[PDB]
Amino acid sequence: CIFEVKHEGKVMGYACLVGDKVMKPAHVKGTIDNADLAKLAFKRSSKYDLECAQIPVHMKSDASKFTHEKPEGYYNWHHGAVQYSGGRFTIPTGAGKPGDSGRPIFDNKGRVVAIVLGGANEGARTALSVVTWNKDIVTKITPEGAEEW
Amino acid sequence: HTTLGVQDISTTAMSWVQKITGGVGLIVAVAALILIVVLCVSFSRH
Amino acid sequence: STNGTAHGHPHEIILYYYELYPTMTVVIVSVASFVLLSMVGTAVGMCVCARRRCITPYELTPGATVPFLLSLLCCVRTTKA
Hints:
By secondary structure, chain A is mostly beta strands.
């Protein structure tokens, strides 16, 4: 379900097969490192900083079902455990660097909860700037002073 | 004494043609404002 | 002479040209062209605004379609496959 966006042979962010679309943050430079995915036609959406397309039939079995459901507590991401509370995702400062955009923040059942875009350093912890689902629609939470990763 | 600059007559008819122009301008002005209003709604939504 | 009947409609409007003239009509035509340009500019702006509206919902995922009809002629046709 997770695929990596490469730019000049360098991983910039990620792409994800959620629902029946193929997502990847709009701000991420590069092209999905997967033939089938790379040749697709994406529809950009600057409001959501999202850029979706449709999953080829032969990969649709590979999608992951997202969720608006996110109760205060700890979430999972590649570098460790993210913490959600006060309507804000945070992590120990240093555990997220430029080149981590696109990486999903899963919950314990695998549902993608948000997609990292960058983070604002506020000391001990960094408030993440993410793309998250609302009641049904996409949204973007960007803490004051975020540094786009 | 004639010999002056118009415009002058012919009323009605004249109004018929005049009324056709400028209305569409008002429409696109209103639509522009409405688009701005919706944009502000989106800005508020974010 | 060159009777300058009133109308109408229009018709007579052009008859006045002969009365007081060389000019008159050409300036009016230029004004009409300017009005057309304003009308065309408005339409172009409106189409760009229509894009601005369909924006956000330009990424992907269910959600119109839906408001895509009622939907300023695209909206749809657009939602679909």
